[PDB]
Amino acid sequence: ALLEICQRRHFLSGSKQQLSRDSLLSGCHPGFGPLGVELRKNLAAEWWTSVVVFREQVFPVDALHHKPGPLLPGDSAFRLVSAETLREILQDKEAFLENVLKTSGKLRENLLHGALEHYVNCLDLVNKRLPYGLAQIGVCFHPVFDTKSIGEKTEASLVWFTPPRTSNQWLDFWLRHRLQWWRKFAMSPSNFSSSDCQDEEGRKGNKLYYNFPWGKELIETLWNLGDHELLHMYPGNVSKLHGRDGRKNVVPCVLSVNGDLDRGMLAYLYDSFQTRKKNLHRKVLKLHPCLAPIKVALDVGRGPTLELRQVCQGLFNELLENGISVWPGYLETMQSSLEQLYSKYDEMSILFTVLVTETTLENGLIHLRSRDTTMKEMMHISKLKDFLIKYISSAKNV
Amino acid sequence: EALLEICQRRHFLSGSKQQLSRDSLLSGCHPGFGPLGVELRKNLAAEWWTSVVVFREQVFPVDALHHKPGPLLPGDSAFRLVSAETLREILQDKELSKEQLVAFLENVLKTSGKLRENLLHGALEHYVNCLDLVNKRLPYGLAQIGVCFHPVFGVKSIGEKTEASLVWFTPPRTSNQWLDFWLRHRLQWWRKFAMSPSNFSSSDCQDEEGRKGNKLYYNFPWGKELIETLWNLGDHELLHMYPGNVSKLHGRDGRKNVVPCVLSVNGDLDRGMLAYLYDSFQHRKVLKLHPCLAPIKVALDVGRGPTLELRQVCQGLFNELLENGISVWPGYLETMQSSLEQLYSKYDEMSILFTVLVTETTLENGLIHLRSRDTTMKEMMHISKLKDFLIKYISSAKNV
Amino acid sequence: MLSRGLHEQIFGQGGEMPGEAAVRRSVEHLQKHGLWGQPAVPLPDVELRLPPLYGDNLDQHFRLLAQKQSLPYLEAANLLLQAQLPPKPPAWAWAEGWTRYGPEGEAVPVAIPEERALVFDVEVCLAEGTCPTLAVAISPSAWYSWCSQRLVEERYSWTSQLSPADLIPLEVQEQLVVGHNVSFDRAHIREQYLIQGSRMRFLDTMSMHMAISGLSSFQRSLWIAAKPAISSWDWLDISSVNSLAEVHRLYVGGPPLEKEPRELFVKGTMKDIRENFQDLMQYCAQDVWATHEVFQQQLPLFLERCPHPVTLAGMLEMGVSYLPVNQNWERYLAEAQGTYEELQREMKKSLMDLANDACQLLSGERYKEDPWLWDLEWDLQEFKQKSEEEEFQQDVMARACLQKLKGTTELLPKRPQHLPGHPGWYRKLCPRLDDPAWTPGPSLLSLQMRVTPKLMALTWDGFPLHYSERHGWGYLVPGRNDVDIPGCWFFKLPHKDGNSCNVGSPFAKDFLPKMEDGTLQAGPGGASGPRALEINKMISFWRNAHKRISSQMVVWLPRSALPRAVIRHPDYDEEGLYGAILPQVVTAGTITRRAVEPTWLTASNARPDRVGSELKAMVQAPPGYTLVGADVDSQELWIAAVLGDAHFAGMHGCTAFGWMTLQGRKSRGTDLHSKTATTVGISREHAKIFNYGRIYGAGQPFAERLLMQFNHRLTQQEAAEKAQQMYAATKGLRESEMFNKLESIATSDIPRTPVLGCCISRALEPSAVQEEFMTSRVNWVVQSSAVDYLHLMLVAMKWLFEEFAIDGRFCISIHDEVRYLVREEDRYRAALALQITNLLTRCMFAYKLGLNDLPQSVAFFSAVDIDRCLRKEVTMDCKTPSNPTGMERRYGIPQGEALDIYQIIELT
DNA sequence: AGACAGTCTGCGGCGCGA
DNA sequence: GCGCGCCGCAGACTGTCT
């Protein structure tokens, strides 16, 4: 229940002590810890591998955080202060100021608008083949009515432009594949779920959920847009909107797959944590090897051999060279026994612990401890880089 | 100026015509970047992360929100982009209708929730818990790439600049020496990928309380423009943001405890992208970007012959290069195929390092044509050693 | 009429007798062991103009119902019987498709075989796919080789159409086709996939082989091994195995059968297509000659041992089916099967954490008090015997000096130490790390390994599942012993006290039930323990049947093959192909002539937490057409009830069995089954299986072990108590149940079936064979009576469906059920005809077993489904998230009543 | 150079589908 | 009621160490 203390003790969550579920789900957290930032980077990298670079015709795009042009009243219950609530009752001391939302910009609440704006240029980039995609990971701002505040959510959005005849199965394919990405990296994949839903105008769609301990919460929405937004934004002509499906030029139906990576991070952090059955109440965050922020922990042994710090720096640098994040625990001072240090790396979700000791200058053997199994291996210091790369790659495979 | 239309045509810079002026690109009021520009920005941010955060054992990530909560914001002090609430941006109001306040008592100048202008402030709030992270060891760092919102000078525009901040907490006795550390290290990082490193330079400067500083400049064709700045600010910001007890403020240095001086290293990745584009351009229309920084590494083509078998083997080579982590342009699954001397020097304008031509020779013995961006020669290579050649490349340019 | 709620009869006269001296026996046996105070509310009467009789008798009506039709199938069978085939064609040229092979050589090419009688067989190339190959059509005109595009290398890859043998000529007659496994060749006849009806029917050699001299269960294997336990052994020599190479030696004689020893025809790729093609074609021609000879000698034996033409015509119409699967059926082959893969990869992951958390023991010997992982290895082993400055190359040279330092004190060159320091059970179940099959964690670990019931806590008082001295199970029940805790695994060796592993259990997924209660939990861990052992319950159906649901070959018909009813409909898609799959079902698969198919003809009812239980679902009708079908309300219960009629007196009130199941209901009253055995016994859904064990004729010990399976009864407690249902229902015969004339029919010599006179298998014939086995012949009586009921429906819908202008004739009978694919415009009237045949057949059985009147409560259907798709009930769902989403559902209708007062003719 | 580590392989059983 | 998989297990060989 109260596992969040660990995310404050080992810095995955924000600095402020009065953290609750509502502030985390709404986006009013003060920030994330460095391990949380690295877990967000791992989640974004896995999303980019599974969605963007592997799948053909998916292209990167950026949306600005602000909308510069004039626009409608917008998504606010309170209609600024010019119309909804004025100071006193209609008093004026005396224009350019207090011009309401006529010339006022808007912070973005979705990445769909930027991708739809860049659709014509990105269709010019491609050879106008109609199966197409635009992907973006970025921070979206939402007003939260705590009674007003800002909630910042890292949203990963894929806008898939699809032919209308096959949109009903393209949405089902992304329903399978996005839910498969959530089924991957999960200790309990049954907590991730999906629900079929309908729009107010009859458009179908799907919503992906995670079963948090308090209740089921939304993490991703797949929505079908039948030319409602694409035709509205470009109403001058439909000739520029026409794309080549096979031989025929037709207007593409839109599919918005928008998930939030901060709540996905919280879902994976809750999924990693699991005080029943055996008496092994070990506080370990069982993150996946490709989502764990720190892969390996490197340390100094009890024996007073000063020269081994050079060996630790060499191993640290060769593991940094080949894309393995290392906790520099060899710099640590007054280490108070190995068991709470091991519990510290278990709470930080570090896959392996490397103990460079006095007996590694001869015979090349360093101690290695796994996160999953609390057992030690006297493995040679050579080919450990290949072993960690093989472990990460073959954990990615299955 | 020809670089602007080349980058627009090859989809580095988004927007139709509004980004043609260099003043829109020097600020952040450009409408966006192309997919090649977005991948280049991701490459530059990743290389900055490896050079600053990864390779240094003490430099750690930080998370700064794009907005301040602004509940106790000072009136008429750092009042840039205050209004927010997801739906208003009033910019700067030199003239105000003061019926009761600037706009309202609870809306403007109080509980406004200002958007961020620099990422130094987020690291300065997270300093206490990140000091707990390094077990109170003083000379450590907090670094982050983030978007900065600035006013742009009848209305005032929004400038969104992608900037990297490194905030260095240091003991004050060696603080200028750590300034000299970052002074040469950031400058060599900017000269690491430069085709001509003489354009990048650095200069010294003076302020009222920091008393020292260094500005890193790039020699654009119009003139020298700031791409990075360094400042040794005192404990004024830390004691101002934490008034009262200094017991949490001072940290453990060599045999003692002392308050830390702060070093601010702020670099503009958007002006860095513009600097590297102007450096890559120099007869024929090419973009000689660095292999570590180029958005697309290899360009795989379909060639000539039966389309189905060449399509299948190109799909296999594409999946192999994707599984090995190399970004590869799909010049296959395009049926245009005009002639020679077009689709070549277009990939050079797309800054792709190598281009692969898969022909009927591949179905005969496995040989494909490789043409380099740096040199115009073509080379016959097997499929199985293409991945090994491409993985020895880029990494060869990394280790000069 | 109003005494038992009977109805007036327009047909079926001659029942002018009142059943005198039989009514008061029914009254005195209703007042004993029966309430007799039923209000007996009259059902609403039904009046409609029925078609008249044939010979003014129901026996004379159902006779010549099977002779008005199938008379072409008698003269074509006679023409196949009388003629003599040319001996052997030696040439067997490649040619192109069909080629006429007469008495001479010369290989004259023909487009299609123009003969009314054909003996046929297909042996397909299994490795290429399901395309027909090597089909020879022997016939009194010619041998008729059909090479099926084996000579031409180039062919279509998928979406097979216009491939099979094309035996049906254009109109510009009836062409009887015989063959061993004629369903397998019937999938490759061509024009059996057409949406409109076919004038051509089929005969199966194994249908006549299991119709006379068939083998049920015990005799079937006994004569396999030969090729009371002590009897006359005449069933050995009188019958042969249903599979091939046994029928030919028994009836024809001579050689046993030719057989290819190399057996590469099922293993033939695109290579090896030219080699030994002639020898393969010779072996196939000899096999079809063997089937021709055995069919020629078994034609009069079948026509005289089954002299009622209803049996032969019912085999003829049940041999033809039509199961139209939609274009999303292959979608069912995707979204189910890959989902199984998902539940294959999650559950194994849920196993691996259970291993990994098991390695968190041993720290200070955390095992040896845990009752699941105390007897494991847990052993240790280890051995070995033979800028300001750069400041970066020193670390590089330090590690590169530590590199190549492995060369001295390398313990072995190729690493033998496979995770030393890990426990010995965890040194197993891990990939080597030397092989390319390396994958992280404790992989290559399965559910069936003996360490798996130790990893997850099975908590059946400490259930180990250790294979030595087990025989599938162990002493696990209760009471006193070992560690004086219930303690299954303390000291196994001296005593198996409190034994529950008495050998004789099914032992084969018998633990799929008793997951719900009956102990057998999955530990209190929550996250990974109970997440597994529910997943195998989800994938138990698809794990055993993914091979059978797949490889059901489908021919998506083109736009030209779609008739005018399909084209230009309000609901129609040309992208959606509605080509059918023909079921590979034998029309006689046991001693009874019931259709047997492991894929389609099972008890599947769209059960939740099952991956692929929507197999009965889909099968969408073509546009403009409707599947109209009805489950029989009470099949074997009513047959055994009217079997008791008129031998312990008539009027359907002979026994307490005969009184209930027609006046009683499932919701209220005693209709046997669940309603009275929830009072006699504790079974709720197992009460149906128990009562089927009584009625089907198993006996006391089968019921004893069956109730032993579900309960903690001791064996003396099983003998003394709770077996009294068999004692009270059946007294000493050989009370509420009568088994007398059931046993006399089981011991009757020549006439066996009461309704048709169809003989029993000669293996179960009591004259030649001293059938001292028992407990299988009563099963033959009840199941073959159900077969005769099925045949009496199938001989019906002729001249209530033939002369009347409704299309149909697609028998999709599964267990006790009838479906017909009719037009949507007359679907309600087709359901009315499907009610009319239910009236006529229940009156036929009432005509045969005693008197002539029939009660109204069984005279019509409770419901006949006019649903688009096939399902058990019309308002059901499936394990997919929504049945109406994706494929469209019209949700069906019950339609219990007769329709209206419209004309019985169309007259549109 | 035999003494002594470990890897296939040929049996028994158990379930279970054609 | 059998064949064919799928694990245990007990040789018997295989290979290496000193």
Residue numbers in the entry:
A (entry chain B): 68 to 161, 169 to 221, 229 to 355, 362 to 485
B (entry chain C): 67 to 219, 227 to 355, 368 to 485
C (entry chain A): 78 to 249, 262 to 316, 340 to 498, 534 to 627, 740 to 993, 1054 to 1227
According to the publication:
The exonuclease (exo) site is located ~35 Å away from the polymerase (pol) site, with no direct path between them. Altogether, our findings suggest a conserved ‘bolt-action’ mechanism of proofreading based on iterative cycles of DNAP translocation without dissociation from the DNA, facilitating primer transfer between catalytic sites.
Backward translocation of Polγ is now needed to separate the primer from the template strand and to deliver the mismatched base into the exo site. The transition from the Mismatch Uncoupling to the Mismatch Locking complex requires forward translocation of Polγ by one bp without major conformational changes. This suggests that Structures III-VI, obtained from analysis of the Complex TWO dataset, represent proofreading steps that follow the Mismatch Uncoupling but precede conformations captured in Structures VII-IX from Complex ONE.
